[PDB]
Design a protein around this ligand. Structure first.
Ligand SMILES: Cc1cc2nc3c(=O)[nH]c(=O)nc-3n(C[C@H](O)[C@H](O)[C@H](O)COP(=O)(O)O)c2cc1C
Ligand SMILES: [Ca+2]
Ligand SMILES: [Ca+2]
Ligand SMILES: [Cl-]
Ligand SMILES: [Cl-]
Length: 146
């Protein structure tokens, strides 16, 4: 289809990269795993703000925590309900962090999504956060020279 995956997007992890310089801080890279989870083609995702994954059962208090993290250029880890193109529900253990350039200025935001069947706690939450934080650090390396 349109927008053949870059090597970055073939990394075998669920992530997106946004560019805050573009209108509504939209997705510029989306991994193949993200595509498969959400059911959008890449051409349907690019240039859109990620909020299209939200729907009726998404907790708006949780969404505001993400908005505040982006505004304060800082990391956050939350869990929220998201929906596929066909309106299918999933829990999203989500981690955001900025990617900084060699002057320390925010160049991109990196988002890592761990989909699940339920809100997680205790060991499942800890193991999930371990995985998405390690992934985010990996994408910080992978995205630095884009
Ligand atoms: C890198 C990145 C990835 C994001 N991934 C998702 C996502 O997977 N699911 C989601 O519901 N929102 C996601 N968001 C959050 C929304 O894009 C948006 O920031 C949020 O809805 C708060 O802003 P708003 O109040 O303008 O909607 C992501 C944001 C960024 C910067
Ligand atoms: Ca999973
Ligand atoms: Ca799932
Ligand atoms: Cl949360
Ligand atoms: Cl659990």
């Amino acid at each position: 289809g349109e927008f053949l995956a870059t090597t970055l997007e073939r990394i075998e992890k669920n992530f997106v990269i946004t560019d805050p310089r573009l209108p509504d801080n939209p997705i510029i890279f989306a991994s193949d795993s993200f595509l498969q989870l959400t059911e959008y083609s890449r051409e349907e995702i690019l240039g859109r703000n990620c909020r299209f994954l939200q729907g009726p059962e998404t907790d708006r208090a949780t969404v505001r925590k993400i908005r505040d993290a982006i505004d304060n250029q800082t990391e956050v880890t939350v869990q929220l309900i998201n929906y596929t193109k066909s309106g299918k529900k999933f829990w999203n253990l989500f981690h955001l962090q900025p990617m900084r350039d060699q002057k320390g200025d925010v160049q991109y935001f990196i988002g890592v999504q761990l989909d699940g069947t339920e809100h997680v706690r205790d060991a499942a939450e800890r193991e999930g956060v371990m995985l998405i934080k390690k992934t985010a650090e990996n994408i910080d390396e992978a995205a630095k020279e884009l």
